[PDB]
Amino acid sequence: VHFHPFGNVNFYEMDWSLKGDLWAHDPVIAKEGSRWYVFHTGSGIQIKTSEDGVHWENMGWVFPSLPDWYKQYVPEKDEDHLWAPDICFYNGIYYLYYSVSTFGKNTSVIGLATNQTLDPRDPDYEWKDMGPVIHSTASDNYNAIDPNVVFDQEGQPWLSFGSFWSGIQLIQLDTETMKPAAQAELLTIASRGEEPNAIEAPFIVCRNGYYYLFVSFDFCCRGIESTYKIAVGRSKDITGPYVDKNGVSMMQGGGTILDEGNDRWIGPGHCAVYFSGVSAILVNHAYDALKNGEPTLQIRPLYWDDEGWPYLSV
């Protein structure tokens, strides 16, 4: 996947028994050369690195001091946590989208940081503040958080995003600015059809001519009382309709459940899906019932059945 490259390594062969610094919430992963990186929710966007994808070490943050412009969109934000980063690699540049918001409110903005490299040893390492991408106010019927970029088969970048309110949104990006045109249409592509509308954290991938929309249902952020689950649907066209195994549109609460956790891992969600060759991984967090509900990084091989639907195993 040109914009999420993982070399030749074979995820289905690897031992994904993670070790090290595994606290994480809302992760994404990128690999540049021999080094792997996690970005996740936390102060200034938290970063972890690994040599192998398995042993993780905490490594700094993107924004030591938050951009002044956040206050123009979310003036009541009073702490430095940035949420749900998303990484892609295009034209030599790393594009890191992220969320500026306050929990449970839809006064929100997605920002963009860019870097020439992910390696802080490189003289050109610098996370540049490239400003807002899309925002919501309290009279909008959507929430501008939880970005994900996908490039369709034809090379057009799209941004999906959303949490609660009318649900998951989709908008085209321009290839040079990596932002929507000012008159670009905003499409709604998934919704529980319930109030509150507990759907968020979209992630789209293409496999064999279908677009797969992964989302998280129900409630994060409650430790062992979290009810998060990972759901998926698919469409031949990136604008929908995304439908689940049963033929139900994701605009009507459709979605096939991929993981709802167990008595040890509570509330898995906020996922990402990456490929290397025909192998794939699912990345998410889950709340550790054996460690005070602390949110923990999970990376697992993601298999695909003979109808094209993803599944986990043991």
Q: Where are the beta strands (DSSP E) in 163-259?
A: 168-172, 187-190, 199-207, 210-217, 229-235, 256-259
Residue pair 218/229 in contact (Cβ under 8 Å)? The answer is: yes
**Between 41 and 72, CB nearer to Ca ion:** 41
Q: Which residues from 84-143 bind Ca ion, rule CB under 5 A?
A: 84
Tell me, yes or no, if 237 is annotated catalytic: no
Distance CA 92, CA 73 (A): 30
- Number of residues counted as binding Ca ion (CB under 5 A): 1
Q: How far is the CB of 84 from Ca ion (least distance, A)?
A: 5
H or E stretch at 116: none
H or E stretch at 138: none
| Residues in the annotated binding site | 26, 104, 143-146, 163-165, 270
Q: How far is the CB of 110 from Ca ion (least distance, A)?
A: 11
Compose the 69-88 pattern: x for residues touching Ca ion by CB under 5 A, - for all others.
---------------x----
Residue pair 97/86 in contact (Cβ under 8 Å)? The answer is: yes
**Between 26 and 288, CB nearer to Ca ion:** 26
Tell me, yes or no, if 26 is annotated catalytic: yes
Marked catalytic residue, from 13, 21, 26, 51: 26
**For strand 148-151 and strand 128-136, is the pairing parallel, antiparallel, or unpaired?**
unpaired
**In 3-state terms, what secondary structure has residue 52?**
coil
Alpha helices (runs of H) in the chain, residue ranges in sequence order: 70-73
Q: How far is the CB of 83 from Ca ion (least distance, A)?
A: 9
**Between 249 and 284, CB nearer to Ca ion:** 284
**Between 118 and 273, CB nearer to Ca ion:** 273
Residues carrying an active site annotation: 26, 200
Which residues would be at the binding site for Ca ion (CB under 5 A)?
84
